[PDB]
């Protein structure tokens, strides 16, 4: 029950409760979450997106360490691309996951990513997790966000975009500085 494993379980759990079968992982990195989704037949489509070629090659590498039925491999798709660009391949998914990605975006990229995600793609579900820098300080990697910053960011999202947000920490209550990992589950409003 490591921290990362806690994050993944938390994300998979949120996807399932929303019955999000078709998922796109933005900033997929080495494919940690992609490996878990591909192995799980609950998911009907797994797509991972990253701007790094090195990371995508590695993702494909470990994803290949899996043994799966033939029809199961056709669910996977790897795409190189920046998250700040409106890619038509980002449409039609039940959910988009942005895991430990926001902290590594500067101002001239965060705003663009927000539109790409909450306006352009506009999936029904969006799961975002980021490190709680208030936990990393009390229990020692410092450009992370505070619980306040993260929650204001997310609330500001529901003010500009057609979404409502629910917070669900995945780590373990301090219970003074909250859990080590903050998660936000955005659900699109009905029309
Ligand atoms: N503008 C951008 N467009 C696409 N990917 C980006 C990006 N900026 C950063 N990334 C990617 O976002 C990832 C941040 S670390 C990702 C870890 C991964 N989510 C996990 O399974 O833990 C890296 O792969 C980085 O290359």
GROMACS .gro file of C-alpha atoms and ligand atoms in nm:
model
  217
    1UNK     CA    1   0.000   0.000   0.000
    2UNK     CA    2   0.255   0.257  -0.119
    3UNK     CA    3   0.166   0.622  -0.187
    4UNK     CA    4   0.162   0.581  -0.565
    5UNK     CA    5  -0.044   0.266  -0.535
    6UNK     CA    6  -0.278   0.466  -0.316
    7UNK     CA    7  -0.311   0.730  -0.584
    8UNK     CA    8  -0.379   0.479  -0.859
    9UNK     CA    9  -0.641   0.295  -0.652
   10UNK     CA   10  -0.801   0.629  -0.577
   11UNK     CA   11  -0.818   0.721  -0.946
   12UNK     CA   12  -0.943   0.382  -1.064
   13UNK     CA   13  -1.205   0.391  -0.790
   14UNK     CA   14  -1.330   0.733  -0.899
   15UNK     CA   15  -1.345   0.626  -1.265
   16UNK     CA   16  -1.552   0.321  -1.178
   17UNK     CA   17  -1.807   0.510  -0.966
   18UNK     CA   18  -1.869   0.742  -1.262
   19UNK     CA   19  -1.882   0.435  -1.489
   20UNK     CA   20  -1.610   0.592  -1.707
   21UNK     CA   21  -1.516   0.312  -1.947
   22UNK     CA   22  -1.337   0.519  -2.213
   23UNK     CA   23  -1.043   0.700  -2.059
   24UNK     CA   24  -0.775   0.934  -2.177
   25UNK     CA   25  -0.472   0.998  -1.956
   26UNK     CA   26  -0.320   1.342  -2.022
   27UNK     CA   27   0.048   1.358  -1.934
   28UNK     CA   28   0.057   0.980  -1.902
   29UNK     CA   29   0.432   0.958  -1.845
   30UNK     CA   30   0.565   0.603  -1.820
   31UNK     CA   31   0.214   0.457  -1.818
   32UNK     CA   32   0.173   0.358  -1.454
   33UNK     CA   33  -0.199   0.427  -1.462
   34UNK     CA   34  -0.221   0.306  -1.825
   35UNK     CA   35  -0.084  -0.036  -1.717
   36UNK     CA   36  -0.353  -0.073  -1.451
   37UNK     CA   37  -0.639   0.029  -1.685
   38UNK     CA   38  -0.532  -0.195  -1.976
   39UNK     CA   39  -0.512  -0.499  -1.746
   40UNK     CA   40  -0.862  -0.427  -1.615
   41UNK     CA   41  -1.131  -0.534  -1.864
   42UNK     CA   42  -1.379  -0.288  -1.707
   43UNK     CA   43  -1.222  -0.019  -1.924
   44UNK     CA   44  -1.322  -0.023  -2.291
   45UNK     CA   45  -1.061   0.219  -2.418
   46UNK     CA   46  -0.735   0.347  -2.276
   47UNK     CA   47  -0.549   0.637  -2.437
   48UNK     CA   48  -0.232   0.794  -2.298
   49UNK     CA   49  -0.099   1.132  -2.412
   50UNK     CA   50   0.244   1.286  -2.342
   51UNK     CA   51   0.474   1.541  -2.504
   52UNK     CA   52   0.779   1.330  -2.421
   53UNK     CA   53   0.889   1.063  -2.672
   54UNK     CA   54   1.121   0.907  -2.416
   55UNK     CA   55   0.837   0.857  -2.170
   56UNK     CA   56   0.600   0.718  -2.433
   57UNK     CA   57   0.858   0.463  -2.552
   58UNK     CA   58   0.906   0.349  -2.194
   59UNK     CA   59   0.528   0.330  -2.143
   60UNK     CA   60   0.493   0.105  -2.449
   61UNK     CA   61   0.781  -0.102  -2.312
   62UNK     CA   62   0.632  -0.193  -1.975
   63UNK     CA   63   0.280  -0.213  -2.116
   64UNK     CA   64   0.423  -0.491  -2.329
   65UNK     CA   65   0.524  -0.687  -2.021
   66UNK     CA   66   0.153  -0.766  -1.991
   67UNK     CA   67  -0.010  -1.084  -2.116
   68UNK     CA   68  -0.359  -1.021  -2.245
   69UNK     CA   69  -0.630  -1.155  -2.474
   70UNK     CA   70  -0.607  -1.024  -2.834
   71UNK     CA   71  -0.918  -0.805  -2.827
   72UNK     CA   72  -0.777  -0.646  -2.510
   73UNK     CA   73  -0.473  -0.494  -2.677
   74UNK     CA   74  -0.683  -0.297  -2.930
   75UNK     CA   75  -0.812  -0.083  -2.641
   76UNK     CA   76  -0.474   0.091  -2.600
   77UNK     CA   77  -0.347   0.396  -2.787
   78UNK     CA   78  -0.035   0.608  -2.728
   79UNK     CA   79  -0.014   0.964  -2.861
   80UNK     CA   80   0.269   1.218  -2.859
   81UNK     CA   81   0.142   1.572  -2.817
   82UNK     CA   82   0.138   1.881  -2.597
   83UNK     CA   83  -0.155   1.926  -2.356
   84UNK     CA   84  -0.197   2.289  -2.446
   85UNK     CA   85  -0.304   2.218  -2.803
   86UNK     CA   86  -0.660   2.144  -2.915
   87UNK     CA   87  -0.617   1.794  -3.053
   88UNK     CA   88  -0.926   1.644  -3.217
   89UNK     CA   89  -0.814   1.307  -3.080
   90UNK     CA   90  -0.902   1.430  -2.727
   91UNK     CA   91  -1.279   1.411  -2.802
   92UNK     CA   92  -1.541   1.154  -2.715
   93UNK     CA   93  -1.400   1.006  -2.391
   94UNK     CA   94  -1.596   0.938  -2.074
   95UNK     CA   95  -1.315   1.074  -1.858
   96UNK     CA   96  -0.980   1.247  -1.869
   97UNK     CA   97  -0.725   1.192  -1.591
   98UNK     CA   98  -0.455   1.447  -1.515
   99UNK     CA   99  -0.233   1.275  -1.255
  100UNK     CA  100   0.049   1.470  -1.095
  101UNK     CA  101   0.060   1.698  -1.397
  102UNK     CA  102  -0.059   2.048  -1.300
  103UNK     CA  103   0.234   2.124  -1.071
  104UNK     CA  104   0.473   2.104  -1.369
  105UNK     CA  105   0.286   2.364  -1.576
  106UNK     CA  106   0.371   2.733  -1.572
  107UNK     CA  107   0.124   3.018  -1.620
  108UNK     CA  108   0.171   3.037  -2.000
  109UNK     CA  109   0.062   2.670  -2.021
  110UNK     CA  110  -0.183   2.610  -1.737
  111UNK     CA  111  -0.448   2.845  -1.872
  112UNK     CA  112  -0.425   2.693  -2.220
  113UNK     CA  113  -0.444   2.341  -2.081
  114UNK     CA  114  -0.755   2.439  -1.884
  115UNK     CA  115  -0.942   2.539  -2.200
  116UNK     CA  116  -0.818   2.240  -2.394
  117UNK     CA  117  -0.950   2.019  -2.114
  118UNK     CA  118  -1.262   2.186  -1.974
  119UNK     CA  119  -1.381   2.360  -2.293
  120UNK     CA  120  -1.245   2.180  -2.599
  121UNK     CA  121  -1.251   1.811  -2.497
  122UNK     CA  122  -1.508   1.869  -2.225
  123UNK     CA  123  -1.541   1.509  -2.107
  124UNK     CA  124  -1.815   1.413  -1.860
  125UNK     CA  125  -1.554   1.332  -1.593
  126UNK     CA  126  -1.215   1.487  -1.514
  127UNK     CA  127  -0.988   1.354  -1.238
  128UNK     CA  128  -0.696   1.571  -1.125
  129UNK     CA  129  -0.449   1.488  -0.845
  130UNK     CA  130  -0.162   1.696  -0.716
  131UNK     CA  131   0.076   1.676  -0.419
  132UNK     CA  132  -0.029   1.847  -0.091
  133UNK     CA  133   0.281   2.059  -0.020
  134UNK     CA  134   0.153   2.106   0.336
  135UNK     CA  135   0.229   1.740   0.401
  136UNK     CA  136   0.569   1.733   0.232
  137UNK     CA  137   0.680   2.013   0.466
  138UNK     CA  138   0.565   1.860   0.795
  139UNK     CA  139   0.704   1.520   0.694
  140UNK     CA  140   1.004   1.561   0.460
  141UNK     CA  141   0.999   1.912  -0.451
  142UNK     CA  142   0.870   2.247  -0.325
  143UNK     CA  143   0.691   2.389  -0.631
  144UNK     CA  144   0.387   2.188  -0.523
  145UNK     CA  145   0.049   2.336  -0.426
  146UNK     CA  146  -0.117   2.399  -0.089
  147UNK     CA  147  -0.465   2.263  -0.014
  148UNK     CA  148  -0.594   2.618  -0.043
  149UNK     CA  149  -0.427   2.688  -0.377
  150UNK     CA  150  -0.551   2.361  -0.526
  151UNK     CA  151  -0.907   2.409  -0.404
  152UNK     CA  152  -0.926   2.770  -0.524
  153UNK     CA  153  -0.790   2.658  -0.860
  154UNK     CA  154  -1.060   2.391  -0.885
  155UNK     CA  155  -1.340   2.613  -0.764
  156UNK     CA  156  -1.229   2.876  -1.016
  157UNK     CA  157  -1.269   2.599  -1.274
  158UNK     CA  158  -1.634   2.539  -1.185
  159UNK     CA  159  -1.692   2.914  -1.220
  160UNK     CA  160  -1.556   2.936  -1.575
  161UNK     CA  161  -1.651   2.593  -1.702
  162UNK     CA  162  -1.966   2.377  -1.692
  163UNK     CA  163  -1.843   2.156  -1.408
  164UNK     CA  164  -1.897   2.094  -1.039
  165UNK     CA  165  -1.614   1.961  -0.823
  166UNK     CA  166  -1.576   1.721  -0.530
  167UNK     CA  167  -1.259   1.686  -0.326
  168UNK     CA  168  -1.136   1.349  -0.203
  169UNK     CA  169  -0.789   1.326  -0.048
  170UNK     CA  170  -0.626   0.988  -0.108
  171UNK     CA  171  -0.344   0.986   0.147
  172UNK     CA  172  -0.401   0.994   0.523
  173UNK     CA  173  -0.538   1.281   0.733
  174UNK     CA  174  -0.270   1.450   0.943
  175UNK     CA  175  -0.532   1.545   1.062
  176UNK     CA  176  -0.395   1.900   1.058
  177UNK     CA  177  -0.246   1.935   0.709
  178UNK     CA  178  -0.473   1.677   0.546
  179UNK     CA  179  -0.358   1.388   0.327
  180UNK     CA  180  -0.036   1.386   0.117
  181UNK     CA  181  -0.226   1.372  -0.214
  182UNK     CA  182  -0.516   1.600  -0.312
  183UNK     CA  183  -0.763   1.476  -0.574
  184UNK     CA  184  -1.038   1.660  -0.758
  185UNK     CA  185  -1.323   1.485  -0.934
  186UNK     CA  186  -1.499   1.725  -1.172
  187UNK     CA  187  -1.836   1.618  -1.305
  188UNK     CA  188  -1.992   1.791  -1.603
  189UNK     CA  189  -2.324   1.959  -1.539
  190UNK     CA  190  -2.626   1.815  -1.723
  191UNK     CA  191  -2.767   2.041  -1.993
  192LIG     N1  192   0.260   2.041  -2.203
  192LIG     C1  193   0.260   1.908  -2.188
  192LIG     N2  194   0.199   1.830  -2.278
  192LIG     C2  195   0.199   1.698  -2.265
  192LIG     N3  196   0.260   1.639  -2.164
  192LIG     C3  197   0.323   1.711  -2.070
  192LIG     C4  198   0.324   1.849  -2.081
  192LIG     N4  199   0.393   1.896  -1.977
  192LIG     C5  200   0.433   1.792  -1.904
  192LIG     N5  201   0.390   1.679  -1.960
  192LIG     C6  202   0.411   1.543  -1.907
  192LIG     O1  203   0.339   1.529  -1.785
  192LIG     C7  204   0.403   1.424  -1.710
  192LIG     C8  205   0.430   1.475  -1.568
  192LIG     S1  206   0.482   1.338  -1.458
  192LIG     C9  207   0.353   1.218  -1.507
  192LIG    C10  208   0.341   1.098  -1.413
  192LIG    C11  209   0.228   1.006  -1.459
  192LIG     N6  210   0.102   1.082  -1.464
  192LIG    C12  211   0.214   0.891  -1.359
  192LIG     O2  212   0.165   0.784  -1.401
  192LIG     O3  213   0.252   0.914  -1.242
  192LIG    C13  214   0.535   1.393  -1.781
  192LIG     O4  215   0.519   1.280  -1.867
  192LIG    C14  216   0.556   1.520  -1.864
  192LIG     O5  217   0.636   1.489  -1.979
   0.00000   0.00000   0.00000
